[PDB]
Amino acid sequence: SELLVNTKSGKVMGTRVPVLSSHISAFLGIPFAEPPVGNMRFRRPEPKKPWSGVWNASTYPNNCQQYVDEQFPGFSGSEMWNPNREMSEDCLYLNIWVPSPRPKSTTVMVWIYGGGFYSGSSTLDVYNGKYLAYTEEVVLVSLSYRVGAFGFLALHGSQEAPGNVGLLDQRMALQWVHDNIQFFGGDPKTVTIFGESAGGASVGMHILSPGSRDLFRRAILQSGSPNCPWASVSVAEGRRRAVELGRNLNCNLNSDEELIHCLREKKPQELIDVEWNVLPFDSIFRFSFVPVIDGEFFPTSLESMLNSGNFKKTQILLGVNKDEGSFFLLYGAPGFSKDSESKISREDFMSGVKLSVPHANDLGLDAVTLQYTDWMDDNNGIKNRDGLDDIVGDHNVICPLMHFVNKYTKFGNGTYLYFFNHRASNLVWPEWMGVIHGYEIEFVFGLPLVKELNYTAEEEALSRRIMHYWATFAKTGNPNEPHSQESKWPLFTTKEQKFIDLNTEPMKVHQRLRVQMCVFWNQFLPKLLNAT
Amino acid sequence: SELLVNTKSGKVMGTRVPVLSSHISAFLGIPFAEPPVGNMRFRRPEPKKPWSGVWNASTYPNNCQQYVDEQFPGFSGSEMWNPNREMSEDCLYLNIWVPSPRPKSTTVMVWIYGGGFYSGSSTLDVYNGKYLAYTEEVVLVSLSYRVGAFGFLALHGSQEAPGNVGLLDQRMALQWVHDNIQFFGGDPKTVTIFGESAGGASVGMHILSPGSRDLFRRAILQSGSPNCPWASVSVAEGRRRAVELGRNLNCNLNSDEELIHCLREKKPQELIDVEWNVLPFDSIFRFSFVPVIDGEFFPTSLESMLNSGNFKKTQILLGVNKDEGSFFLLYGAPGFSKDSESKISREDFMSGVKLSVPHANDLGLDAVTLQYTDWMDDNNGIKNRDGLDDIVGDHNVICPLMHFVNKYTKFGNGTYLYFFNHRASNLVWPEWMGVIHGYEIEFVFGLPLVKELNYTAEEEALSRRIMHYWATFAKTGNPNEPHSQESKWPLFTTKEQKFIDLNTEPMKVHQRLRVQMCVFWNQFLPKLLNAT
Ligand SMILES: COc1cc(CNC(=O)CCCCCCCNc2c3c(nc4cc(Cl)ccc24)C[C@H]2C[C@H](C)C[C@@H]3C2)ccc1O
Ligand SMILES: COc1cc(CNC(=O)CCCCCCCNc2c3c(nc4cc(Cl)ccc24)C[C@H]2C[C@H](C)C[C@@H]3C2)ccc1O
Ligand SMILES: *[C@@H]1O[C@H](CO)[C@@H](O)[C@H](O)[C@H]1NC(C)=O
Ligand SMILES: [Cl-]
Ligand SMILES: [Cl-]
Ligand SMILES: [Cl-]
């Protein structure tokens, strides 16, 4: 009864799940699209045909086909991000957590996982929706979308492999929520989309895309924004990378039709095995198959859209972590190790700069080096390590997001900006990595509320504050409860540019997040590269 | 007897002058060249024809023809730099102070006044050599040389106005010292040349020029070096500026001989009246007529000479003042005033940057602006003022000198580097100007030893320390008296790059003088300009 819901696509039967000494309802693995298999590989998604009978929605679906990390086999800190279910191209499903008893018409939050557009799953332990749904009495949805070449192979001109189909998967799931969430006790007029990393970039891309704007109310972006250097490519570069994928698999490169037909004959893992080979440079924080600026999903360049105010005008809440860069340095740059302090020699520093900014000429690499080198002390392995960490995080995450936040605030209806700088007491990664890319998510999803997970009492309190900010924002457009006597998170404005730290300490308001470095990344360096 | 000296050019009668509580011998206004007047204007100097009878050397000579500063009429802070004797093209004379009784063969120090190559006089109060000669028992010489167009009009190819004749004036005075100083009790084998501003540049130029190297033993350079951006021009630019001077004065421009013939008919003040109009830019710290890189005084470019070690290898002592820039900003940049704290608006900051780096393109100016702007606080008028002050000092004096010091020390025989950062207690210029271009000179010449000048006891001690460093370096190639127990001024080395502060506090040793900004000015910005 409470677990039996009739949707426009057919009936579903959910499951009663325990959560912090209570219970809520979960509907796991609801299909929202036709399986993008066989002749539908690389194609825009199609709506799921209605089914007869009762869909058993008591277990998580399959995860999409993706590269799996084996750098640290069995290590919890990496394995928590890997698919925990069987991989299949039959992967377009969503999950819903509903408070018990069912609300009449409550605020909806829709989670979009990150993972560089090449990886990610709705089913990770860290994305478990039950704590946030129960604690804040929201209807929490997690969608899925095709990643890698399956979601973002782009042969512009072709209707068979147009690009951005992973973004259209997200949209089709949002359309399903719009059509069906009322039957689960959600208000389709009060849907907040939120996501981290490529999920954060995606949230911003739906803000930008006209075809998406009317499918959600407001938006939260975590450590990602649509203008990130890794988050899109031109149609030309998307074409080049698709052809290089064919060449890597002895495909007929004569035409789009022959190349696509060849690529459709391959087992998914044959694509995944060569996926990294199509990148133009040795690089870190760069991903092969990402959204294309196509003229359809994106009418024009992102910069012209941002400048013109051509985007959904609403409220946004967004922010970054203190050490976004460290994970990518561990996995891809010389001298870093998870088992040492990773003091970086000057030689390794210069090597990391070139990997971190692979599109730069030598004059640009000199500019970056000078900006992040203390020439009184250039052989200090700690300053070299932290300098490189800052380079990666500033260029790839923080300054793109600050450029977005400043353009958006000129036209939007309310901006709230945060700086997450809490290092978790039980982190398994070494100290030098700081506050890592991805590690605010466990706080957003309420994991510190689980006593078995061994967070401190102050971390539980921080998680509860963060969940309440996010949910109050979703409900109202403001993370603050006015008439309350808690410290107030101020609006980010064009003039004062305020933001807060998120950590276990009493609130601090600051201004101009990393302004010095972001002037370099957002204004000076692009001018240097456009001149030379 | 003591005051009557027979030189190789004729007899000279000096005068007995009081110094503190004693006396010494002064030989003032001794001619070392034929008057460069009439058809000899712009020509290389020729040796002074010997005279019969006794030259009356009891009186300071005339000053060379030069622009006179009237910004602050009657103000001691500016008038102390203006000619204090009648100006005349008949101005190639030198002054000698001899200890009494006359020494056998003692250390010689030859002062070369600065003034941007457009101004300066051997006869200013602040250059009175009696205190140094008496206190340190050296023979102190001050020379003169033609400034402005009279010294540095350059029509390369012409033997009538070849350029660099002011530098040749200085050389001929050095040749005179070489030939005659033994008759005044000086050792011509132990001559130290020293100078400030254009005098410091000149000293470095005599180190570089083969025709100069055998006329002195070692060198001191104060707030100027031969590679400074204001200190020389190419033959094409000197020619351009010489033609433009003619155009300003309705001269025949058809040939070198016609132009020179025209310019030799003008009264000296007619040339001076338009001197500044030939500069290629609105600028500050740029001067119209300066040494040319001609292939004769300078065999090749200054950089290639420094790179290959094509220069005199000896000991050098050299340094800079904390606030080299402030004087030039006061005189030529918007927002500055001697009667206010001169807080600088952002608009005036950007104006000053363009005046300070006149040769830069827009990308270059953006680079300088970013390097010196605190973007957490860009509307702070104090920071804007101090930023502009650092830009001028770093670009024009400090970083060029650090480039010279690093290149020279690769081949030289001993380098001693100082940073003068004492603000005089009796300064008449306002506080914002700090430690001003030129204001270490009074300490080098022992003016704090005169009680009537109102220096503190500590400033007298500092002057005595500096005089002793300068004189002991001149005698031995090392400013320290070994076997003594004062703190030791260490050799600047390529590896450790040590320098000392010069102030009233006990001596501190530092390393890598303004290394962060001079990487910018010496390596990154010139690479940017050369690519753009
Ligand atoms: C020559 O150029 C180079 C090219 C390469 C090509 N890379 C490879 O072959 C291995 C890929 C490893 C990905 C491992 C992904 C592990 N998921 C992690 C994720 C996040 N936080 C992590 C934080 C840590 Cl601490 C460890 C793993 C993390 C936050 C997310 C956001 C993500 C982007 C993924 C994901 C979800 C490598 C080095 C180079 O130099
Ligand atoms: C917009 O810019 C422009 C501005 C103008 C108008 N200004 C001019 O023509 C020059 C006036 C300066 C002469 C003032 C000479 C006063 N001597 C001074 C000297 C020195 N220390 C000083 C320190 C102070 Cl505190 C004041 C005067 C000083 C140390 C020396 C080294 C020197 C270079 C000169 C000299 C000896 C013209 C064209 C422009 O483009
Ligand atoms: C949001 O829009 C409403 C409606 O016009 C307006 O009253 C309000 O001031 C806006 N808020 C912000 C922060 O711009
Ligand atoms: Cl639980
Ligand atoms: Cl006296
Ligand atoms: Cl050395």
Side-chain angles (χ1 to χ4, degrees), chain A residues 1-507 509-532, chain B residues 1-450 452-507 509-532:
Chain A
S1 180
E2 191 183 13
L3 304 173
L4 181 66
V5 172
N6 184 39
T7 82
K8 290 172 160 30
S9 315
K11 299 180 183 158
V12 310
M13 180 71 173
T15 187
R16 176 153 188 96
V17 305
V19 48
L20 310 162
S21 296
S22 189
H23 303 82
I24 56 163
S25 309
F27 303 79
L28 304 179
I30 300 174
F32 64 87
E34 286 288 288
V37 302
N39 64 314
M40 314 253 277
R41 181 187 282 175
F42 311 131
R43 265 196 217 158
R44 296 177 228 270
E46 295 296 335
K48 169 79 171 179
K49 285 157 189 162
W51 61 91
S52 56
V54 184
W55 195 279
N56 196 320
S58 61
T59 68
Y60 275 138
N62 300 306
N63 303 141
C64 294
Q65 289 287 352
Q66 61 195 258
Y67 181 85
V68 175
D69 168 40
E70 307 178 50
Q71 187 66 46
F72 307 107
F75 183 58
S76 60
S78 57
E79 293 290 350
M80 63 176 280
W81 305 104
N82 279 339
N84 57 348
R85 291 299 184 281
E86 229 174 70
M87 282 186 302
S88 171
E89 276 182 276
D90 187 5
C91 65
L92 294 183
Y93 301 82
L94 50 87
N95 314 294
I96 312 188
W97 287 265
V98 188
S100 186
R102 185 185 306 176
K104 270 187 149 293
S105 162
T106 194
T107 141
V108 183
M109 297 175 78
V110 175
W111 174 248
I112 306 183
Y113 57 71
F117 293 110
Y118 75 91
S119 67
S121 305
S122 69
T123 63
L124 302 186
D125 285 355
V126 71
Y127 304 153
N128 190 343
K130 66 190 196 189
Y131 310 108
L132 183 50
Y134 170 76
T135 301
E136 296 295 306
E137 199 129 42
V138 300
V139 163
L140 187 77
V141 172
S142 53
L143 54 74
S144 62
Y145 59 98
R146 288 169 276 181
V147 291
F150 308 98
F152 299 98
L153 188 93
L155 285 165
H156 190 232
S158 169
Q159 298 308 315
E160 223 52 32
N164 298 334
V165 303
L167 291 180
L168 299 163
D169 298 340
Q170 296 176 14
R171 179 185 288 170
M172 181 154 297
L174 290 182
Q175 179 75 53
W176 192 98
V177 171
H178 173 84
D179 291 344
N180 292 284
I181 202 70
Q182 55 192 249
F183 309 127
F184 298 86
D187 175 17
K189 289 163 66 53
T190 316
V191 173
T192 292
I193 60 167
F194 69 133
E196 182 265 353
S197 193
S202 292
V203 159
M205 290 172 175
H206 294 298
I207 288 162
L208 286 167
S209 178
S212 294
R213 295 179 194 157
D214 300 314
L215 294 172
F216 63 96
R217 178 65 173 275
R218 48 188 62 104
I220 298 164
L221 301 81
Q222 297 164 205
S223 294
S225 59
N227 50 312
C228 287
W230 50 267
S232 56
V233 291
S234 68
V235 291
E237 174 70 0
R239 174 162 297 277
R240 186 197 70 74
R241 286 185 193 173
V243 171
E244 187 70 17
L245 189 76
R247 183 179 290 111
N248 270 264
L249 301 163
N250 300 326
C251 274
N252 194 322
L253 309 186
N254 255 35
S255 67
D256 294 352
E257 177 169 26
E258 272 152 316
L259 171 57
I260 292 167
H261 185 265
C262 180
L263 292 169
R264 282 185 177 155
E265 309 251 322
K266 306 287 172 180
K267 313 198 311 292
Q269 205 72 49
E270 296 182 83
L271 271 41
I272 291 164
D273 283 349
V274 295
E275 180 199 304
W276 298 96
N277 295 347
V278 315
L279 288 174
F281 319 108
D282 293 335
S283 54
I284 58 168
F285 219 135
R286 294 294 186 271
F287 318 113
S288 295
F289 296 103
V290 300
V292 277
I293 312 305
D294 57 355
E296 291 255 10
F297 201 98
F298 304 106
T300 66
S301 72
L302 307 180
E303 190 57 22
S304 56
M305 298 187 70
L306 287 173
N307 279 331
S308 71
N310 184 17
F311 47 79
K312 179 183 178 82
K313 281 96 165 166
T314 182
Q315 307 90 26
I316 65 170
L317 180 156
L318 71 173
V320 300
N321 293 2
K322 177 171 124 274
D323 306 287
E324 304 280 11
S326 64
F327 148 54
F328 304 86
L329 290 168
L330 167 66
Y331 275 73
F336 296 90
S337 163
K338 95 169 174 68
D339 305 311
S340 88
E341 289 188 30
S342 299
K343 294 180 202 214
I344 290 313
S345 85
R346 190 80 207 147
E347 194 177 66
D348 286 341
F349 180 82
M350 296 298 292
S351 278
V353 171
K354 191 173 180 39
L355 299 162
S356 305
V357 198
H359 55 284
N361 52 30
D362 282 288
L363 188 68
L365 298 168
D366 292 333
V368 178
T369 293
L370 182 47
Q371 190 80 190
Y372 285 89
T373 296
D374 170 2
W375 280 113
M376 287 185 285
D377 196 12
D378 48 311
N379 285 313
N380 183 321
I382 284 187
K383 288 173 184 181
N384 285 336
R385 181 196 72 205
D386 294 349
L388 213 42
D389 204 344
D390 285 350
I391 286 166
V392 179
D394 291 346
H395 167 64
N396 285 290
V397 177
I398 297 190
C399 296
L401 186 140
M402 295 307 305
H403 184 71
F404 173 80
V405 78
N406 275 284
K407 299 285 174 183
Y408 188 84
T409 297
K410 293 194 194 305
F411 292 95
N413 190 229
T415 298
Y416 296 91
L417 174 72
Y418 69 84
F419 182 75
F420 182 85
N421 63 355
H422 181 71
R423 157 116 187 161
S425 60
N426 56 11
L427 205 81
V428 301
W429 296 104
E431 291 251 85
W432 69 261
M433 302 187 76
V435 187
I436 297 169
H437 188 57
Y439 279 85
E440 91 289 352
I441 298 171
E442 49 201 63
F443 282 83
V444 172
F445 277 84
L447 267 60
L449 280 54
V450 189
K451 276 158 223 317
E452 295 92 332
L453 293 183
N454 288 308
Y455 293 87
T456 66
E458 312 87 276
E459 286 166 328
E460 165 170 8
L462 172 57
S463 181
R464 293 183 172 277
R465 259 173 72 239
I466 285 180
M467 290 197 287
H468 197 57
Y469 286 148
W470 264 228
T472 306
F473 176 77
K475 178 196 273 242
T476 71
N478 183 339
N480 303 293
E481 259 170 332
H483 316 324
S484 89
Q485 49 244 23
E486 259 58 21
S487 318
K488 302 284 194 294
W489 184 346
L491 279 161
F492 178 99
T493 61
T494 293
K495 203 220 191 152
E496 295 194 291
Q497 297 173 58
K498 296 170 162 177
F499 72 96
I500 66 162
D501 298 331
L502 287 176
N503 55 41
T504 51
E505 288 175 348
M507 173 178 305
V509 177
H510 310 279
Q511 297 184 116
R512 305 189 157 186
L513 201 161
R514 275 192 87 78
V515 57
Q516 196 72 31
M517 287 311 100
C518 293
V519 173
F520 172 84
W521 291 106
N522 294 342
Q523 280 135 80
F524 178 73
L525 187 68
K527 188 135 188 245
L528 187 162
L529 299 173
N530 198 38
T532 46
Chain B
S1 177
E2 200 178 7
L3 300 174
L4 176 59
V5 176
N6 180 36
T7 84
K8 290 181 174 147
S9 322
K11 299 181 184 168
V12 299
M13 176 79 287
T15 180
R16 188 153 165 103
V17 304
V19 48
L20 302 165
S21 285
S22 193
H23 303 82
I24 56 165
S25 312
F27 303 82
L28 307 180
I30 297 173
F32 66 81
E34 287 291 293
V37 306
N39 293 329
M40 287 169 89
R41 180 188 284 172
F42 311 124
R43 259 191 228 153
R44 296 183 170 89
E46 309 272 357
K48 168 73 175 178
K49 268 135 55 197
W51 59 88
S52 54
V54 192
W55 197 277
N56 189 335
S58 75
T59 282
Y60 270 144
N62 294 323
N63 297 142
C64 292
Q65 287 284 357
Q66 60 192 265
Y67 179 87
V68 177
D69 167 39
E70 297 194 272
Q71 194 60 47
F72 304 109
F75 183 60
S76 64
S78 57
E79 297 289 353
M80 68 176 279
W81 302 105
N82 277 339
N84 61 348
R85 293 299 187 280
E86 260 170 281
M87 287 186 295
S88 169
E89 282 183 278
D90 185 7
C91 63
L92 297 186
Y93 300 83
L94 54 84
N95 312 296
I96 317 191
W97 289 265
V98 185
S100 188
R102 182 193 301 171
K104 268 181 149 54
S105 71
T106 197
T107 301
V108 177
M109 303 181 73
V110 179
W111 173 247
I112 301 180
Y113 58 73
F117 294 112
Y118 72 88
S119 64
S121 304
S122 75
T123 65
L124 313 193
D125 288 352
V126 70
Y127 304 153
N128 188 340
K130 60 182 183 185
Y131 313 104
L132 186 53
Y134 171 69
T135 299
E136 297 297 308
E137 208 157 315
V138 300
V139 170
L140 192 79
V141 177
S142 62
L143 51 78
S144 61
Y145 58 100
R146 287 168 277 174
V147 298
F150 308 89
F152 297 101
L153 184 97
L155 290 160
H156 188 240
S158 171
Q159 296 312 308
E160 290 294 313
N164 295 324
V165 310
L167 292 170
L168 298 165
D169 295 341
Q170 296 168 18
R171 179 183 287 173
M172 189 139 87
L174 292 183
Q175 181 71 57
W176 193 96
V177 171
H178 176 89
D179 287 343
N180 289 283
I181 201 67
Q182 67 194 68
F183 309 130
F184 298 85
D187 177 9
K189 287 171 122 289
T190 313
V191 176
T192 288
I193 56 169
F194 67 130
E196 184 269 354
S197 185
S202 293
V203 162
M205 286 167 179
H206 291 301
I207 285 162
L208 290 160
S209 190
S212 282
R213 289 176 204 165
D214 298 318
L215 297 179
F216 64 103
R217 181 67 175 280
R218 44 183 69 99
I220 303 180
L221 299 78
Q222 301 163 205
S223 305
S225 57
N227 52 311
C228 285
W230 49 270
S232 60
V233 294
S234 61
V235 300
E237 175 67 9
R239 176 168 286 281
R240 191 198 62 79
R241 304 184 178 190
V243 169
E244 185 63 24
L245 187 75
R247 178 175 294 115
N248 272 265
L249 301 160
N250 295 322
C251 278
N252 197 318
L253 303 186
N254 262 37
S255 69
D256 286 352
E257 281 283 327
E258 271 161 313
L259 174 58
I260 296 162
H261 187 274
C262 175
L263 291 165
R264 288 176 169 163
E265 313 307 318
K266 307 293 166 178
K267 329 211 170 183
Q269 207 52 46
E270 291 183 83
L271 310 190
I272 291 164
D273 275 350
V274 298
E275 186 184 316
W276 297 97
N277 304 348
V278 313
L279 286 174
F281 311 114
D282 296 322
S283 52
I284 58 164
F285 218 139
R286 290 296 182 271
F287 320 108
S288 278
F289 298 103
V290 302
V292 278
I293 306 308
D294 61 345
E296 317 170 41
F297 197 92
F298 301 106
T300 58
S301 77
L302 308 182
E303 185 68 2
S304 69
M305 294 187 61
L306 288 165
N307 283 332
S308 67
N310 185 12
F311 50 78
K312 176 183 183 79
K313 283 92 167 171
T314 181
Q315 301 86 31
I316 65 175
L317 181 149
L318 71 174
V320 302
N321 298 0
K322 179 167 120 280
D323 305 290
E324 302 286 10
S326 63
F327 148 51
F328 303 89
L329 291 165
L330 174 56
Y331 273 70
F336 295 88
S337 156
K338 92 162 175 61
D339 312 303
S340 79
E341 291 177 11
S342 302
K343 291 168 189 157
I344 294 307
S345 83
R346 190 79 205 153
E347 181 190 284
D348 284 344
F349 178 85
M350 285 186 287
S351 278
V353 172
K354 173 113 185 130
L355 298 165
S356 306
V357 202
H359 56 293
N361 53 24
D362 292 323
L363 185 66
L365 302 170
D366 291 335
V368 175
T369 288
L370 180 49
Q371 188 82 359
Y372 285 91
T373 299
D374 175 356
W375 281 109
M376 283 156 72
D377 195 11
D378 53 302
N379 283 315
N380 184 321
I382 288 175
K383 288 182 182 166
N384 287 343
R385 178 197 74 202
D386 290 353
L388 211 48
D389 202 345
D390 285 334
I391 286 162
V392 181
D394 293 343
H395 170 57
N396 283 293
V397 175
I398 295 187
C399 297
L401 187 140
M402 292 313 297
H403 182 75
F404 175 76
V405 114
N406 278 288
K407 295 283 165 177
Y408 190 83
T409 297
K410 264 185 39 92
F411 290 96
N413 202 236
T415 297
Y416 296 91
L417 179 60
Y418 71 79
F419 181 76
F420 182 82
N421 61 349
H422 181 72
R423 155 118 183 167
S425 62
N426 52 5
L427 213 81
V428 304
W429 294 102
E431 289 231 286
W432 71 263
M433 299 178 77
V435 183
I436 298 173
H437 192 61
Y439 276 79
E440 91 291 354
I441 293 174
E442 52 203 49
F443 281 83
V444 169
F445 278 81
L447 268 72
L449 276 59
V450 183
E452 332 183 340
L453 292 184
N454 297 170
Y455 294 88
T456 71
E458 290 75 14
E459 283 166 340
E460 158 172 0
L462 169 58
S463 180
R464 294 187 176 278
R465 255 175 75 239
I466 285 169
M467 289 202 285
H468 200 65
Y469 291 144
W470 264 230
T472 310
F473 168 86
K475 306 168 162 131
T476 69
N478 178 340
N480 304 291
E481 263 173 330
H483 293 5
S484 93
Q485 30 208 37
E486 324 301 295
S487 35
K488 302 289 184 288
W489 187 343
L491 279 165
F492 177 95
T493 65
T494 311
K495 201 203 178 167
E496 300 201 82
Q497 296 171 59
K498 301 174 161 176
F499 67 99
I500 70 163
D501 290 345
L502 279 178
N503 53 44
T504 56
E505 299 170 29
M507 167 201 303
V509 179
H510 315 278
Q511 293 176 229
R512 304 187 161 199
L513 173 41
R514 275 184 91 68
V515 58
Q516 196 73 33
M517 293 308 102
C518 297
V519 176
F520 172 80
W521 292 106
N522 295 163
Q523 280 137 266
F524 174 81
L525 184 63
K527 196 193 201 144
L528 185 159
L529 296 182
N530 195 32
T532 61

